Amino acid sequence: NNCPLDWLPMNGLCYKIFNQLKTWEDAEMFCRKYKPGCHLASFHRYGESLEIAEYISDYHKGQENVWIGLRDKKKDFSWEWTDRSCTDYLTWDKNQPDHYQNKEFCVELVSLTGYRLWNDQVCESKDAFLCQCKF
Amino acid sequence: NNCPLDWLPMNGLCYKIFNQLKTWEDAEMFCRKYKPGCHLASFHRYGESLEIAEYISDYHKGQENVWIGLRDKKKDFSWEWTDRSCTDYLTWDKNQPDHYQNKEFCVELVSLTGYRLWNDQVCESKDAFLCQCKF
Amino acid sequence: NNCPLDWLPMNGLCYKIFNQLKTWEDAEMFCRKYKPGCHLASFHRYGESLEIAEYISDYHKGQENVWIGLRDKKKDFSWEWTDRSCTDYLTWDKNQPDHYQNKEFCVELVSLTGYRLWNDQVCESKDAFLCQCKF
Amino acid sequence: NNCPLDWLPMNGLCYKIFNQLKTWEDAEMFCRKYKPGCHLASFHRYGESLEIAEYISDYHKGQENVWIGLRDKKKDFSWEWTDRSCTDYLTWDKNQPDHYQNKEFCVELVSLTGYRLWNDQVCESKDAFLCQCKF
Amino acid sequence: NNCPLDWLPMNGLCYKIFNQLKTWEDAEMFCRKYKPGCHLASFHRYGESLEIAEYISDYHKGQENVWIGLRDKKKDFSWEWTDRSCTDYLTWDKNQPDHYQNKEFCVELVSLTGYRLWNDQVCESKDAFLCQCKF
Amino acid sequence: NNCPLDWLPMNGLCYKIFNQLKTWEDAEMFCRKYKPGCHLASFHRYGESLEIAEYISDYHKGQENVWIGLRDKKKDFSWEWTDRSCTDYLTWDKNQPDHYQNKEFCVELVSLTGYRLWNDQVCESKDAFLCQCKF
Amino acid sequence: NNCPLDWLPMNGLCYKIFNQLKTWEDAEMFCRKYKPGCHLASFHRYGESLEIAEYISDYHKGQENVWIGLRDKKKDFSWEWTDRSCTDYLTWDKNQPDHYQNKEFCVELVSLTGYRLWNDQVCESKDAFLCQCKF
Amino acid sequence: NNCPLDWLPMNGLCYKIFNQLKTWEDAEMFCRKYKPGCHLASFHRYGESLEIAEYISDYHKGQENVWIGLRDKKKDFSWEWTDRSCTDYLTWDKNQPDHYQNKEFCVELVSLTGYRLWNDQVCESKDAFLCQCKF
Amino acid sequence: NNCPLDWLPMNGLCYKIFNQLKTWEDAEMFCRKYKPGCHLASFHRYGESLEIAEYISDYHKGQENVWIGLRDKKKDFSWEWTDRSCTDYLTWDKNQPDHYQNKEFCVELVSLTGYRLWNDQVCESKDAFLCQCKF
Amino acid sequence: NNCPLDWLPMNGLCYKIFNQLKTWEDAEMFCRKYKPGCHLASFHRYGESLEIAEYISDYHKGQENVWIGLRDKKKDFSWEWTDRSCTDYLTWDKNQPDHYQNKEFCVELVSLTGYRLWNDQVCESKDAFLCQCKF
Ligand SMILES: OC[C@H]1O[C@@H](O[C@H]2[C@H](O)[C@@H](O)[C@H](O)O[C@@H]2CO)[C@H](O)[C@@H](O)[C@H]1O
Ligand SMILES: OC[C@H]1O[C@@H](O[C@H]2[C@H](O)[C@@H](O)[C@H](O)O[C@@H]2CO)[C@H](O)[C@@H](O)[C@H]1O
Ligand SMILES: OC[C@H]1O[C@@H](O[C@H]2[C@H](O)[C@@H](O)[C@H](O)O[C@@H]2CO)[C@H](O)[C@@H](O)[C@H]1O
Ligand SMILES: OC[C@H]1O[C@@H](O[C@H]2[C@H](O)[C@@H](O)[C@H](O)O[C@@H]2CO)[C@H](O)[C@@H](O)[C@H]1O
Ligand SMILES: OC[C@H]1O[C@@H](O[C@H]2[C@H](O)[C@@H](O)[C@H](O)O[C@@H]2CO)[C@H](O)[C@@H](O)[C@H]1O
Ligand SMILES: OC[C@H]1O[C@@H](O[C@H]2[C@H](O)[C@@H](O)[C@H](O)O[C@@H]2CO)[C@H](O)[C@@H](O)[C@H]1O
Ligand SMILES: OC[C@H]1O[C@@H](O[C@H]2[C@H](O)[C@@H](O)[C@H](O)O[C@@H]2CO)[C@H](O)[C@@H](O)[C@H]1O
Ligand SMILES: OC[C@H]1O[C@@H](O[C@H]2[C@H](O)[C@@H](O)[C@H](O)O[C@@H]2CO)[C@H](O)[C@@H](O)[C@H]1O
Ligand SMILES: OC[C@H]1O[C@@H](O[C@H]2[C@H](O)[C@@H](O)[C@H](O)O[C@@H]2CO)[C@H](O)[C@@H](O)[C@H]1O
Ligand SMILES: OC[C@H]1O[C@@H](O[C@H]2[C@H](O)[C@@H](O)[C@H](O)O[C@@H]2CO)[C@H](O)[C@@H](O)[C@H]1O
Ligand SMILES: [Ca+2]
Ligand SMILES: [Ca+2]
Ligand SMILES: [Ca+2]
Ligand SMILES: [Ca+2]
Ligand SMILES: [Ca+2]
Ligand SMILES: [Ca+2]
Ligand SMILES: [Ca+2]
Ligand SMILES: [Ca+2]
Ligand SMILES: [Ca+2]
Ligand SMILES: [Ca+2]
Ligand SMILES: [Cl-]
Ligand SMILES: [Cl-]
Ligand code: NA
Ligand code: NA
Ligand code: NA
Ligand code: NA
Ligand code: NA
Ligand code: NA
Ligand code: NA
Ligand code: NA
Ligand code: NA
Ligand code: NA
């Protein structure tokens, strides 16, 4: 009804992991250009993080990390979602975010954590990615 | 429509009884692989038990017991649903759960009770099963 | 399109008259086996009665009365709907229900009242019937 | 979606102009038998008159007037809608309704006014007609 | 799904930029004649401007401006939407509207502003256009 | 609180039986002049009839009938509520309304029916009355 | 409660007729300074005209007309409400508005019509006035 | 806001235990006559039972049992609430209901269970009671 | 009455201008200490801007600008509301914000724009201010 | 209004910090005795922690830690809220909970963290406390 068969429906939106590897920026443009009304995913509750993590664990083969829509463009710990939603929830991995070497401003789901925790990472890294769309 | 023709729409979700016999664990992952977001069914009110019980008695094939999403992971009688909803409702059959022979940590609907009551059973045993999805 | 094109959409559900003549219980089992989530129809509002009456008058030829889902299972004047919804609405015909000779425990729409009012009738009578479904 | 592609969705219902010419009675019965849950159209606010008027102009060419669901069944200026909705809104053309020569009891949208205003007319006149359905 | 796959679902409606050059009036008629209930788009919220601006930037390349449904038919700065919705939100570009040379009465989204802001333009100019439909 | 302590809160409105005897018109004017936005009560649901019937039985002793806001001003059975709400629910007593002797045009709740059913009565008769107000 | 006892609650706002005589400008400023969130009244549906008309008749005796919030600020028949709401509804008296002798730019409810219909009048005329507030 | 200080607010309603002792019938009439829109309490979810039980334990001194609105007038296990709500939830004590000596048709909260479980009891018994009101 | 009589009710909250002149931070602490749940005002809709502008123009004498709750805490152009609501709406004045000489990090309504548009200003400036509260 | 003047309204409930020092248990029963339905506060999202933290820092008296409704009854680290809401959120301070000296099974907001983080503490120790009510 709300979403096509191969998309995860949650709180009015539809989510899908893509196994293809891309930079954070390339992943966002792809989601946006996939169908009108799409972006890399934004998270707003713990239940979402867990339902999403399990979904990726079941539908994604490999240990590659997954890009999500959070980023720090101003480069000063002001994380914002590409979909323009509120940053009213977080779940950083242990010791994150750390702006490692001052080159990490794009967020990724950490494979080692069952895709449940976030990590700021180099945007030029090649990760799989999670799109979020309205249908 | 809210659900495909052969699914039971109920309080916003869709349910279906599958007659193929599987272990509790394979019944779960089967549901999750039918479509992203599905799980073995969870119950939260008396009306659902009755509705579900009637649906199964009308649509199943055979006289098998049915696996649902409730399971005792810690083995300390701490029942949790695979869909992560709160365990705010329970409807055990007479004298259950009994962790019989300390080898029962999975819940099934009991066929002899017309599929209304629950019973903790051996997870490696095979049963028919009830999936729950959001479309 | 909440319903197939040959069903009447009404307050979240779908309705359809079946002109084949059946006993009250055979009608209920036919609705039940039609598709999951169906029963003989339940009524909860004055507006539903008038809408259903006209629908029946237009799609139901002849003057056979029509079975709906109300019945007195305990034979004690406690009317219940087969869909388990609340009995919070009643529109009995003149001098009904009367449990005539204590042999009438099933409810039908009365052809003579333009299918607006109800009558308790011998359950084994053959009437056309109104199914209700969730799609 | 709320309506088929060939229909106009407005405030919860679906509307379609039919260009076949019919008497008011035949137009009402055609709508009723088109599919369950339909009637000639009722109007309740100025926006609806304006939206319908433009819709007909775009999808109904020619100078034929259009039947709608208002009629004077008691013949004493008691205008009621066939869909049983409230007569809480009227938009009569200049000097209407007038029961001209006591032969006018059905209401049509007047082509010369761009289908904005109403006229009471001989029910046996052949006009195009506007149906309203629930899907 | 609320909209066809190549349309943008937004607050109950569906939007689509058509990359064809037309005068303001031809663009309105094209939308109106597409399916019943469409018009050049109306805007009522800041979030809509941002969402539309981004969508247009991604699905409409080049520098052609885009027609929207606002127009000053009376020519005394009384801006009205073709879909008759209320003019309760405005987002004019710097120093607009200005009725430049008494020849500008139709509104367009300005490419140079990233399609975020509005400008009144000569109605016979050729722009791409944004349709809005209710499905 | 939605209503003063001696008024019955029901579906957004406040109701109160006044145990004073008045003609139908004096009863309407009394309610109207009580506070801005009051009228003799209008009814739209079966649940309201039951709730009101019980309330009146408990707070109005004796056998005097009770005026409600339904009246046939035109005298051709066109029943309208004084609060201008839609006449979309009726619950006439046996064989009513009958315009007995061409002198009955105002409606009252019938004491002998437990204030559940309606009757058209001579407007100059003295009944207690039921006011409805928006606070 | 939604409004004080001395005010009429209608569709979310509160209305009160003031019997003091004032020019249209003084009436608008009195409403604004009465308390934050008030203006002379705006109308958007026929029900409101009818409810307001009766309210004024009951709580405003005498033959004085009543100021409401509609006015032609540009002086070219561009009627706008002081509360910035949409002019989506009009109910002018016979042959109004007429800009009689080019001195009429403010709108009053006409006493001779029972306060149902409107007239454009000399803004400096002393009329009673209707305020609208949020509480 | 919703309820007076000494009442427990839950799901739109207000609840209060009265320490005075009365028969079931006398307790119901008292609630009804206390203020318009009151009855002995009805329960519809487990959380209600527990929040209520705790409230009574804290505000009620003594070990006397508490009457609630459930009863079996037809005397055949058809329990219904005096407030006319659905019987979509139950929580009988161990081995209840038992229609002991065929003289128990009124329900009471069992003090020994911390007022959490129900017991069918003699209606002529003197218990404290829980009223439920709308304000 | 969602608010005290000297406050402006608006979309669930209450607003009030304070004419005393304070630095941006002293204004925020004054709103905070006024009553629990108060801050300098946040804006989220075009309609709020216009309503607040008129309210200020009527209850605020003089031309002192007015502090609102937006500020750039990280001094990096990342504007946040003191009430922690989402920055999903902006209405900057011409050529603002400009961080003039890198000393302006607090936002005020501009008197010259009729209090409609915003300007980033030196936080130590003395302005009147707008509080917002939940009552 | 939703709450009394000296209470903090937040997501439908009312909160207040009490400075009187009490044991965790007496703080709980004190809240329950302030009004039926109250309990020590429960948290379910990051925004509440921040809102509450700020409120307390502004309205308390002293530098005491604050008791909240979370407590480990079974002493097996199974935290439950006194208001019976699900424990779907947690925000422990550094290295907590530690069941230190196996004598800590009650949670307090830590003053040195600006009242944002939690810590399990000795239940017999005294602290300021945060009540939560529904009015
Ligand atoms: O060194 C900081 C760096 O950590 C990376 O993640 C580490 C992780 O913290 C560590 O526990 C694991 O063993 O190896 C990972 C990969 O080196 C992050 O990817 C990076 O963003 C920084 O946070
Ligand atoms: O012995 C515990 C065991 O009981 C099984 O159920 C029994 C049931 O108790 C008995 O009354 C019936 O006749 O036979 C059933 C099947 O042996 C449960 O299936 C099992 O899970 C345990 O609970
Ligand atoms: O007499 C009890 C019996 O009545 C039937 O209804 C009658 C009805 O009263 C009469 O008006 C009509 O002409 O004939 C009907 C059929 O004989 C009911 O159908 C039956 O259920 C009983 O209630
Ligand atoms: O004479 C009453 C008659 O009017 C018809 O309408 C007229 C209309 O008023 C006039 O402006 C136009 O030029 O000619 C129409 C047709 O003669 C109505 O159609 C008819 O119903 C009567 O009301
Ligand atoms: O001069 C009025 C005219 O402005 C056009 O916009 C111009 C703008 O004036 C100029 O400064 C900028 O460099 O180029 C813009 C695009 O041509 C408007 O497009 C036109 O409608 C008038 O308003
Ligand atoms: O006869 C018409 C008349 O009926 C009154 O009701 C009577 C009823 O006719 C009678 O059978 C019963 O015993 O007493 C009723 C109460 O007087 C209506 O009240 C009146 O309005 C007319 O409809
Ligand atoms: O002549 C235009 C003039 O009309 C006034 O209203 C008239 C009204 O039309 C008439 O029916 C009544 O008897 O006398 C009124 C007052 O002369 C309007 O008040 C005025 O504004 C003009 O429109
Ligand atoms: O004897 C059945 C009878 O039980 C009463 O309750 C008992 C309860 O079951 C028992 O465990 C306790 O020791 O004493 C109670 C009082 O005798 C019920 O009150 C009655 O309704 C029956 O169910
Ligand atoms: O020049 C930057 C400076 O501008 C101030 O605003 C000016 C405004 O540009 C001008 O139109 C008006 O006449 O005078 C204002 C005050 O000098 C802003 O107030 C200031 O914050 C900076 O943005
Ligand atoms: O030792 C465990 C104990 O810690 C207390 O908190 C300490 C805190 O760890 C330390 O950093 C700070 O300087 O002093 C605090 C007070 O001693 C907790 O209060 C207590 O509950 C335990 O967790
Ligand atoms: Ca990192
Ligand atoms: Ca078992
Ligand atoms: Ca019968
Ligand atoms: Ca005519
Ligand atoms: Ca221009
Ligand atoms: Ca009568
Ligand atoms: Ca005039
Ligand atoms: Ca018993
Ligand atoms: Ca500036
Ligand atoms: Ca600790
Ligand atoms: Cl009803
Ligand atoms: Cl907006
Ligand atoms: Na999301
Ligand atoms: Na479930
Ligand atoms: Na039904
Ligand atoms: Na209609
Ligand atoms: Na739009
Ligand atoms: Na009413
Ligand atoms: Na208004
Ligand atoms: Na209840
Ligand atoms: Na705000
Ligand atoms: Na809470």
From Swiss-Prot, chains A, B, C, D, E, F, G, H, I, J:
SMART domains: CLECT (SM00034)
Disulfide bonds: 3-14, 31-131, 38-133, 106-123
Tissue note: Expressed by the venom gland.
Location(s), subcellular: Secreted
Xref: InterPro entries: C-type_lectin-like, C-type_lectin-like/link_sf, C-type_lectin/snaclec_domain, C-type_lectin_CS, CTDL_fold
Record domain C-type lectin: where: 10-132
UniProtKB keywords: Calcium, Disulfide bond, Hemagglutinin, Lectin, Metal-binding, Secreted
Residue numbers binding Ca(2+): 96, 98, 104, 119-120
Molecular function via GO: carbohydrate binding; metal ion binding
One cellular component term from this protein's GO annotations in UniProt: extracellular region
UniProt motif (Galactose-binding) ranges: 96-98
Protein origin, superkingdom: Eukaryota
Keyword Metal-binding: yes
Signal sequence annotation: none
Task performed by this protein: Galactose-binding protein which recognizes specific carbohydrate structures and agglutinates a variety of animal cells by binding to cell-surface glycoproteins and glycolipids. Calcium-dependent lectin. Shows high hemagglutinating activity (MHC=10 ng/ml).
Complex formation: Homodecamer of disulfide-linked dimers arranged in two pseudo-5-fold symmetric pentamers.
Similarity comment: Belongs to the true venom lectin family.
Protein name, entry field: C-type lectin Cal
